[PDB]
Amino acid sequence: MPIEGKYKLEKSDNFDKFLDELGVGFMVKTAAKTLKPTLEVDVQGDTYVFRSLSTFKNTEIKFKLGEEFEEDRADGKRVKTVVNKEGDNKFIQTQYGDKEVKIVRDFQGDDVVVTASVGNVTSVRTYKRI
Template sequence: MSFSGKYELETHENFEVFMKAIGVPDDLIQKNKDLKSITEIVHNGNAFKVTVTTGSNVIHNEFTIGQETDFAPIIGDKIKSVVNLDGANKFIVKLNSVTSVTELSENKLIDILTVGDLTYKRISKII
């Protein structure tokens, strides 16, 4: 299954609480809480290029399944981690205290980020 495509954020749950828990400043939370974001994924074999654009903020990450990579997080310095594939439609990465699970289900991209007992869920539709 190919993840390639552009996805627009439809809904998200627990954004403010989650962002506060990972140390995002209140002014950035308020500035970004109602902005729609676009995720563009280029998937070629085990290689992925992921660009998330929210307002004027752009986060770009490239990784290969099973290989250590530097990731640009929401805030702070780059984090080294390894992305693992779970089945054909889900990948998982641990970024310090945050576990990120991204799943492709029909025409939806579902991101679930967890830190401790807090979960932030994003659902994006293909455009």
């Protein structure tokens, strides 16, 4: 309930090198530099929906905690993934595959700190509630 709402990206750090390590297409990496996405969060009982709204693509994962599902990632790849909750502010998504991705979404009131990691490359992206 307190995590629901919309949050606009305010600061991004090292997201370019994160996409270099993840290995996405040039056009995708190019569009990410200028993109200022909005995270939309909705919860219906046990079912969570995290959206990324932007001119590039509007993406959506819907999931129950701890239950694996397939995600069509914005880079075009379909990955097996799971989301688990840590404490009650923190949601940790794991995207399995050859390069395993950890995406921590840390909800701190009107600020969300998203920390994405692959290999030895980490990006931090901060969103502010709108």
